[PDB]
Amino acid sequence: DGTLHAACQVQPSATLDAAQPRVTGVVLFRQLAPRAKLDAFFALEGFPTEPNSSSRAIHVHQFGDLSQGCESTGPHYNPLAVPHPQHPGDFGNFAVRDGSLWRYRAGLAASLAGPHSIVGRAVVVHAGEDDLGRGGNQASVENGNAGRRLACCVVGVCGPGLWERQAR
Amino acid sequence: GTLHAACQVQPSATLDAAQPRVTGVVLFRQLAPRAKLDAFFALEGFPTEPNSSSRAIHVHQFGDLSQGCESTGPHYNPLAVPHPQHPGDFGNFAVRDGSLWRYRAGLAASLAGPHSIVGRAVVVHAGEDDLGRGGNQASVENGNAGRRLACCVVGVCGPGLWERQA
Ligand SMILES: [Cu+2]
Ligand SMILES: [Cu+2]
Ligand SMILES: [Zn+2]
Ligand SMILES: [Zn+2]
Secondary structure (H helix, E strand, O other): OOOEEEEEEEEEOOOOOOOOOOOEEEEEEEEOOOOOOEEEEEEEEOOOOOOOEEEEEEEEEOOOOOEEEEHHHOOEOOOOOOOOOOOOOEEEEEEEEOOEEEEEEEEEOOEOOOOOEOOOOEEEEEOOOOOOOOOOOOOHHHHOOOOOEEEEEEOEEOOOHHHHHHHO | OOEEEEEEEEEOOOOOOOOOOOEEEEEEEEOOOOOOEEEEEEEEOOOOOOOEEEEEEEEEOOOOOEEEEHHHOOEOOOOOOOOOOOOOEEEEEEEEOOEEEEEEEEEOOOOOOOOOOOOOEEEEEOOOOOOOOOOOHHHHOOOOOOOEEEEEEOEEOOOHHHHHHO
């Protein structure tokens, strides 16, 4: 009703080397009301199956600009000028098992509405684990040392269908 | 403050093997929240015969590429008006030798406000928009512009693309 829905078709970065994995999938967002915390769904494939598991970071980056693949999306979206991992799109780490990632998350800080909306911004999936600001360099407090940008998408307005169908 | 947006046009995920593969960029610039929108279109990949052709580009309701361009919904119509008065009804563009290149000023779409096209879809079609003059119901809903070939989700971007791509 006042519920907001968004979607993001994660696709490999245009700038990848042949050696890098090619990650594809979907991120869905659902926010029951403007003041509500964000719910999300993440389902990705294309990670290496050996090693059989890994931890990978996903965040929101400032610009839905895929002109240089994921590189052109800019830094973590940071409308309140705070350190990582206080950015609204700091979604954290996700467990990859046998090449796949499948996870719902709730209580996210980001919004689909208002001045700090992530609609039209980028979701970026990284090669590495987010150290959550606990590493011993400046990068830790910018991006969590999450490493190379594997795959990304622009967050789009969508209907309720995708979320309803996925939930079943 | 000026707003800029970009849309990285790519072939639909759901094309068959015999359809053309159209790629390129649409850039947007809005000087103030209630200014008319300026847009730049630069695409390639159209069939090179017929050497000349006219092809429609529109904004569709949903930035949803789950089914490629098919899942982007109908034309975005926040102000409840018939085709071709939708804000993202960009009209027909001259394609010559596979390519399309055009600047349009003073479009009645917005990057700001409740009716923003940010996060919606730009869709490039195989045919020409009949601009509401086709003589049937579809004509005043979508202009009978044929199949959806290529699309993208409109993204917030910095000033750089607009300065360089012109
Ligand atoms: Cu990131
Ligand atoms: Cu269209
Ligand atoms: Zn961050
Ligand atoms: Zn229309």
